Structure 1
């Protein structure tokens, strides 16, 4: 549905089952997306900051953080950490 318990602007089912970011909006994941360079993300639906870093799951997934952070730290499971 449209439930969002941690209020990180990603639905609980999307986080549970997989999602990707396009046009700053979280959408469901589809197999045809992987051929176009998109990535599939899964994250904790009860925590706003899954990896414990100062950036939320949506902020990491969307890349709305510092442009100097590596691209591998854009998924919610790898922490942006110096």
Structure 2
């Protein structure tokens, strides 16, 4: 609509991207609030003009939600 036009098809919304951040929840990316830190959720941002912001062959949505491989360590989960 007004603030949901993802340029690159990283399947993630640019308002949730350049701003304070986002966090997955039930396999769906939602806005970030500061009270999520008690439960164990992180906060990360990315580049809204690309679909691979680190060069590695996994996209931003595929790397935030851990649906890529179960052997890659969780230290390489934020994009």
Name the TM-score class by shorter chain: 0.7 to 0.9
- The CA RMSD over aligned residues, in Å, is 2.6
Change (3 A) 1:37 1:13: closer
When the two structures are superposed, what TM-score results if normalisation uses the length of structure 1?
A: 0.78
Count of aligned positions: 76
Cα deviation for residue 41 of structure 1 reads 1.1
Runs of 5+ consecutive residues of structure 1 not aligned to the other structure: 76-81
1:14 Cα offset (Å):
3.1
- 2:18·2:47 contact (CA, 8 Å) conserved in 1? yes
Q: Is the 8 A contact 1:12 1:45 kept in 2?
A: no
* Structure 2 residues not aligned, in runs of 5+: none
CA distance, structure 2, for counterparts of residue 57 and residue 24 of structure 1: 13
Please identify which structure carries the higher helix content.
1
Contact 1:16 1:44 in 2 (8 A): no
TM normalised by structure 2 equals 0.80
**For the structure 1 residues 10 and 62, does the alpha-carbon distance in structure 2 shift closer, same or farther, using more than 3 Å as the test?**
farther
Runs of 4+ residues deviating >4 angstroms: none
